């Protein structure tokens, strides 16, 4: 299966060189599913915030981008209330060369500046555009929750 080899050399790339603040690993029984880590950048409101990610991969990974869902509480304008960050240009007719590390770095970059156009959490978008108090406070408390959420899987 071409998708299996795709994930295999993605894992090789991760094991060799991992982008700063990003880490991932698949599961033995099903390599299709993944567990991913993201650290909020230094100057962002998400400083030192570690947030888990879950990536259920469709069988035709080259044709269809993986279905991605956050495993921790997130308050971001581009992140749905279910934690399902949505990707819709990765499935276009001509997609650029991408791997899981690339999309994880894209999410990490998005964590600094949101995309007000086409938002996912409408209240988060309105809170970011003006009245930043509740936005920054909610980001800080989500960082606290993500820190507190000790996982034992």
């Amino acid at each position: 299966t071409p998708a299996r080899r795709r994930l295999m050399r993605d894992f090789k790339r991760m094991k060799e060189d991992a982008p700063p603040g990003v880490s991932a690993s698949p599961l033995p029984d099903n390599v299709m599913v993944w567990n991913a880590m993201i650290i909020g950048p230094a100057d962002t409101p998400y400083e030192d915030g570690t947030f888990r990610l879950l990536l259920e991969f469709d069988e035709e990974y080259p044709n269809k981008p993986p279905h991605v869902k956050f495993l921790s509480e997130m308050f971001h304008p581009n992140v749905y209330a279910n934690g399902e960050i949505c990707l819709d240009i990765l499935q276009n007719r001509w997609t650029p060369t991408y791997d899981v590390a690339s999309i994880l770095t894209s999410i990490q970059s998005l964590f600094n500046d949101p995309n007000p156009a086409s938002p996912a959490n409408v209240e988060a978008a309105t809170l970011f555009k003006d009245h930043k108090s509740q936005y920054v406070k909610r980001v800080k408390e989500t960082v606290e929750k993500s820190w507190e959420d000790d996982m034992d899987d």
Partner: protein, 1731 residues
Amino acid sequence: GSLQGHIRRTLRSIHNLPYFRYTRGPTERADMSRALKEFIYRYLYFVISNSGENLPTLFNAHPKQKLLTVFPDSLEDAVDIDKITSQQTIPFYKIDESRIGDVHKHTGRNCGRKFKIGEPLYRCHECGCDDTCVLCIHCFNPKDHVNHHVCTDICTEFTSGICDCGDEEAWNSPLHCKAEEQEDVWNDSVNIALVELVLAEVFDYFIDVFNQNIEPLPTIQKDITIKLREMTQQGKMYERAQFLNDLKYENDYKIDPENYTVIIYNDEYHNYSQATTALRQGVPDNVHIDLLTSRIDGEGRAMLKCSQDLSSVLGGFFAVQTNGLSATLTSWSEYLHQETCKYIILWITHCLNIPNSSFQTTFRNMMGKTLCSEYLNATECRDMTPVVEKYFSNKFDKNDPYRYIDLSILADGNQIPLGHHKILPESSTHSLSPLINDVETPTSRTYSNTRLQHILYFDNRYWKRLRKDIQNVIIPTLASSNLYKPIFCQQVVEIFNHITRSVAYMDREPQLTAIRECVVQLFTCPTNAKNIFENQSFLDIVWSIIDIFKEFCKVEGGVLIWQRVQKSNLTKSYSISFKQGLYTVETLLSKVHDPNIPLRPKEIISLLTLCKLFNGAWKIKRKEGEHVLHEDQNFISYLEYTTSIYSIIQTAEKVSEKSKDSIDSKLFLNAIRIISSFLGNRSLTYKLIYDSHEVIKFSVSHERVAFMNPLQTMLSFLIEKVSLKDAYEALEDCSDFLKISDFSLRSVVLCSQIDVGFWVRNGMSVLHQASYYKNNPELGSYSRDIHLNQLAILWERDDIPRIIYNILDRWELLDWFTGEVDYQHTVYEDKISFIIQQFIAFIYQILTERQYFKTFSSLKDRRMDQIKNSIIYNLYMKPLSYSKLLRSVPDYLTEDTTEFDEALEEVSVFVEPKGLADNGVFKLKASLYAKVDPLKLLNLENEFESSATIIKSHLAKDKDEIAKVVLIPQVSIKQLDKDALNLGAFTRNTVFAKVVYKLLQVCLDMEDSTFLNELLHLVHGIFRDDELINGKDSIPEAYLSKPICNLLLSIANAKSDVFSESIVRKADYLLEKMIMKKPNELFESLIASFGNQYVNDYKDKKLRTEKERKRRLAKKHQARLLAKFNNQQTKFMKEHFTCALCQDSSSTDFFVIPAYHDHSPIFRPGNIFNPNEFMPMWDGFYNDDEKQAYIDDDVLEALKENGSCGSRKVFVSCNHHIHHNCFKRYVQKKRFSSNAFICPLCQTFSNCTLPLCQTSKANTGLSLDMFLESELSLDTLSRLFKPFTEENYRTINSIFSLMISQCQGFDKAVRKRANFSHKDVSLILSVHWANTISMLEIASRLEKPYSISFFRSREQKYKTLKNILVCIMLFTFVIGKPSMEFEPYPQQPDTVWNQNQLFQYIVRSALFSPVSLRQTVTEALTTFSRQFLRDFLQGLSDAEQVTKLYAKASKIGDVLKVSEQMLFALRTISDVRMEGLDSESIIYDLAYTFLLKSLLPTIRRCLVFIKVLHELVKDSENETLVINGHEVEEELEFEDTAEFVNKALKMITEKESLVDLLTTQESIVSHPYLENIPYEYCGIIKLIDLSKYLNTYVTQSKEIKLREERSQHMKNADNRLDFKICLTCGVKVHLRADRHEMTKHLNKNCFKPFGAFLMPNSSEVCLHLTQPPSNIFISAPYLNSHGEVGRNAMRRGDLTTLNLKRYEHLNRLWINNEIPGYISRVMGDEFRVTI
């Protein structure tokens, strides 16, 4: 003498002639009208000249079409019509030639030159006394305004005006006309008397004929139609005929009448469709009546039918009622006289264009004198009043003094009727009545009653064309006439009310009124305004406008309130009426000489009467329940008119400030008393909450509330202008200031209520209104309301608690504060926290800004401080460009551009732009960060924490102290009034202390931090104010009795999670500051409720971050989780070219790479003996401004050929590999044509494709060594290709055949040439490859290190070259070489096929002939050198000019010296016997330099060939190119001229030096491309040399000399500034607003495929690609004085210098043929519609 009688007899007999007697069809109107025009022109020009002999002094004696005399023989010779209709006479009067240079010399008198379409207007923003003073081209002197803001504007259709040169009052500084920088026959008494007589007779005839033209009057046309109907059904035709004869024009010089016609009139009631339907219903007989008749109505009036018998026409005349078009019935003689007057007006306009200066200065003066002289002939001329009296007695009231003007009719005896004059009595000026102030109406007035007054009064009777002509001939002539300007002003003022009433109530097309032009060209003058104010006529104007307004008034709440127009106004006259009246008031006030004049009792009461109607006229109610279905639109008119009034007040303030003399304080006190009394006369519901506290009852969420309250704004202004004590004294004794301040506070409360989105149930219109109330463009309404509230608080020293209860009541917070309702269930529901945030901001604003109570040295300093504060509060968020900064700052602050620029320079520091398309930004100075208070009024738009954190970051010494620093509140008492120091009284009161305590307690209990930061900042400000008032270590006792310190301690000793660090740090700072002030009285309070051990531990807690433990545990958690991830990865691993669609498939399908294949404009021949072409060495890019843009004929033909001839095409590509099958699927699915498409990766335009083979150097020993020393046979390199397959081979055949067939990039000439087969494609492909290499070299010329420039930064270009080489090699190997049997480009003895034929032969020999490259280069170079030496030595125009040519070259640069061995070699090659000097080394040196410079491009292209050869044979990715054991970059970096040439010869040629090469014998080979080698351009190839400043192309277009394009080079093309500039060729292209905006310059006279045009007006360069119709606009490489680019740079007329780097980037984009790619990439998805 007899001249007057003769003129009258001739003019009053036009219908008496038999030619005009009978009515004719529409096609016979045209020739009859031409005959009338010619006859009138001829007759009047004959008469105006003395006996008809003075014409040659005016017009050309012998014009064209001579062979029937030029001028009329006598009076009878000019009056006859047999000659005119026979087309025998000639239009001598026409002066439409090229000699008309509008040369007008004036001294003091105004230029008065009307502006044609496309002419510039030079509105200097500093010399002009106002914004209306313009200048014309011939009157503009650029020397006067070095370093000014000259906003150049292009005249349009709707823009009509005159120049103002020589008007000393209109310019702040004296100016010099450009003309001044460089036997009389019309001055005798007889001629001036004669012209006066002619003009007087003309105007008297005009007034006489139109005085009886009551038929098209809007007030009467209706009952004319009704009465004519009545007599046509009741069948009594005798009185119908009597009525028609009465209405008919009359002069003293069956039964139904005849020679009648029907005329309709234009209007704005209907569009084209309804008018056409009405015409079609009117008379079906009129052919094409829906087509021909409709457009004539578009210009004035038209005639739809005409016949002798009235019965037929009358039946069709009743089309008036069908659609309401104002159609009238008129006699043929009356129409003839009306047309005669129209042509008379045309003649008078034409007479103003005669070049004779003396004739003009006499004609204008006499015409003005006749216009302004008293109108006699009133008695003799027919009085029209008896007719309207007799036929319409019902509408004519006998006793009414306004019986006449209500019908737009003169008075008995032909006098101006009585206007609705209203003078107010002094006894009614004591107070401002709630309704209209009482006035008296005089019943007698003594008008001058002159010709001009009659003409202006008849303005409602004319048609559009005749109207516009009359204004254009009268208004500019009289207004510019310095002798008759004041007289014109008086005459139009005396009749102002009649004009205003006409344009308001009785006018068919109000927008064409003359009053707008009258006010614009008259009232905008200090002398006229001063004269108006000296009389009471200004009061008459104001009261006329007030009478216009009062018809739509309404009564609401005891006052008179304006209302939106709801009556039927299909003519829309009322909108124009209001706009014109308000503009007139504002203009007249703007130019008041004495600032006291508007404040005088009569003037002030009239102005306040005008402004009162709009005081709180607009009311909104908070919609609740269901959202409004449709957004309200009613507010627009209220916005407009209240903006006009606000501008009125601001203009009054401006004229008060600018005038040196001050204003008497008594006038200010009287104004304050009047306005305060009127506003206290309001009725307001009252209520009591406690026993002895009484406040107004008003629920903002339920009841109507108004944003704009101009009267309170005026009151705030007037109070500010005087002392506080004097303002209090001027207040009425029996008055309550809360009554007048509660409306301002209501506005503030409503704004803060809608800010938090409480009024979302109303439409977006209410939000638009609210945002308009904030930062209002014309005036600071919000700040004035805050000032009024501050005054109300400051002037209640007896019942301070009442103020706080009232203030907090309107916010609807009193229910919560008193405990009536809980905090959560206030009327605001969950939005209570935001409302409280706004409330705290409002209180802080009340306390902090004491600007209105300060006393500055001058009003200029006050304005400067306002500007500085606005800039500071607009900049500190982030650095911003000049345009955005101007956009943010309120409009009334930016008008004084010099002051704004000075303040901006003082406040911020300029940050230069870094990129190539970015604006220069301004960064606020760090030292000014300490002066920013993030809660003051100016920061209203932003939030609080964000501004706080930004200021903290800019104020923290490091990232550690981002949240550990506090913002000192900005409260001060510097330069403050004595009575203003007590603003802290309401804060230091017990009630407000309880309010603060309750707010803090609810914040702790509910744990909401939304308003906590604002509240802490407010408490800090209160403490700072108390310290400033009382002194050191002072604390307000109010916060001591109520223990707030416990609440602050609870804030401080939180869990660091309920509140952020900024809240916690601020609270502890407040505790420490107040505890340090007095610890004993304060430590007792803490232990009273929190015990003792908290307090004792607090001191231990003090003097010893918290998150350091948090950060450490976060880091430990990170380490644990990353270790877990690594363990999971380890256990998982222990458990176990790029396509566009076929990823990892490794398919053998060939990767076809999209490419662009099109001509280039960079190929041009270089004429020999040209020092500018070969001498100057190139140190990279440059630009010489001193030489004007210019093109030579041969070069222009070269560009045209390059556009046309296909032998100059070049391949450029993006190198994006794509499968052939995937490419076919892309073509089919996306439906792009195979001919032209866009790359599916970069979206770049592409037309041709070329595949890449799987190259490899395995199992071979190829290198550059045997390429130089052995054969370069194309097969000896094709051996690199891998072995192929039969399927692969046939696939290659198929793909190459389809590419050959389907690609049009291949030249049609060689396609149709004889013996052309598929094997000949290799030759033309190699030609295109050599052309691409030449393009690369030409582009590389622009870089500083030209020796090795082509090597660096051309990786993509080198990839394209390698791709092309591999593709052509694959084609040749698969198909086969053609053995060079066929020549694609024959060596014709008349045409040059390629400009790089030398390198073309080099390529042909190297690739095709299996011979060594090092010998082919020597052969080509030797042959070219021999040809060039023969041409240069045997050339002419130098034998006696060698000395001057050498001197010119030495002026350009340095000529190399030839050594004796080189002397001998050059002499051996060829010697000349023309050497007549002692030492002939000069010609040899010149030949040496010329040959070296000519050969250098070929040498560099050969090096590029070697480079691509190495790249094709490179061992490793990082392998430096080496030749004969030397690195090319190392051995050529610091090599110049002859040394560089010799080193290159050693590197690439089998020879060793230039001398050694010359020593080689004359080997002759008959290659087609070596015979008569063409010479190409040597110097730098680039775009034109633009001027240093773009202002030159606009300001000094007359001075600059530029080549022009003859296409449509007419119609004042020598002065219009609509042109573009072609950067490719320098040919200026005029835009005449026709034929696709003149895109024809691409199709001819320039390079066709693409070009770049510069627009100086918009300061943006446009790029056009002709294959589609597409084009784009990008910022021109010009950088404004204040860092700006694009269209924003040229606006405001700033100096616009040239940025070299941006222009070099543009040149590099153009040269490399990236312009089509750039254009394709810019649109993106938009470019798809082209294909």
